Amino acid sequence: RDKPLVFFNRQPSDPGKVDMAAMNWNDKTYYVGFDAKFGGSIQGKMILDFLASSESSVDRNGDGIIGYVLCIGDVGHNDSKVRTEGIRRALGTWTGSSDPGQAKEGQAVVGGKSYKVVELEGKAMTGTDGSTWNTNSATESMGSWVAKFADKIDLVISNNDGMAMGCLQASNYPRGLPIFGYDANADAVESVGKGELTGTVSQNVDAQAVAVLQIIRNLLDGSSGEDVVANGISRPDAHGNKISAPVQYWEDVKAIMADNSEVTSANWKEYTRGARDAGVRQVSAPTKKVLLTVHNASNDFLASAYLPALKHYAPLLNVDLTVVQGDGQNELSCLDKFTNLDMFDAFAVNMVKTNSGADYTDKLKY
Ligand SMILES: [Ca+2]
């Protein structure tokens, strides 16, 4: 068939190269995701810009060193390693390894002056039960870090929000000690608003949600070429709607990729629980039917963040959204519910196996 087909959240590929056979299903096929590989770089940037804007006061003991402690989530997990590498490279403490204990003396500018940077300690947070990204171990480690390093700690850095909020639960957390996380969880963004957590990082789920719906509307409304991926996304559409977060377009892979955004005192209100893009308003237009797929009904992120975003923005773009969800293990749990395709004007597919692009395009021929 020749209807719009927007893959999202999981990019068609070998589980490593993009499945360009799927992407070229037709000239109305796209992918929507986010700039994942650069996530660590953005956390690092946030931390560097914070220090750059700081006075000499952030150097608590005034030894000309910016000392930090690092919460590692999982030494074998890609997201942990990317975020560790991201902040270590940014601070110049990177040696080629994301492992704990593997850092060198670094450098960073504070108030126009060069400071040494030392990773006082980086530690994997693991529970007694073996569970990783462990919040309780973070709380305990933070408490011990205060006792051991005391005024040497100038900031705390964490692979995620969960562990960072764990650190803030330490009964002896030094008052006003800067600390940074990652994920932009609700409680984390709230903390940023209260001036406790210093920063975190968002993948902009809302931007991704709107982009899926906007690409579809642009296509069904008769747009072609640059308009399809720009209107309502990186510039206002005919109605004035426009995604607020920055978004990229990767042409060779037909991918609309939201930036990773840092979340600080400067913009936390835009990322709090239930916050929605004020740049996307109700449109007066004919209703269009969209069948949307979810690879796992039990996935917390898709269930708690992505789907609710989709359901909020869809009626504003006059999209009648029908959602079907799989179990998370077999591709059939989605394909079976991927029927009645003659009833819909467009399709958004989130498959469990990235290489299963051909299974869906086959059903689009009947
Ligand atoms: Ca110091």
Author numbering: 11 to 25, 28 to 378
What does the paper say about this structure?
In this report, we found that TpMglB-2, the product of gene tp0684, is very likely the D-glucose-binding protein of an ABC transporter dedicated to the import of this vital molecule. The overall fold of TpMglB-2 resembles those of LBPs (sometimes called “Periplasmic Binding Proteins”) that serve as receptors for nutrients and cofactors in bacterial ABC transporters. LBPs generally have two structurally similar lobes that are attached by a hinge region. TpMglB-2 has an unconventional topology for an LBP, but retains the hallmarks of ligand binding and ligand-induced conformational change that are common to this family of proteins.
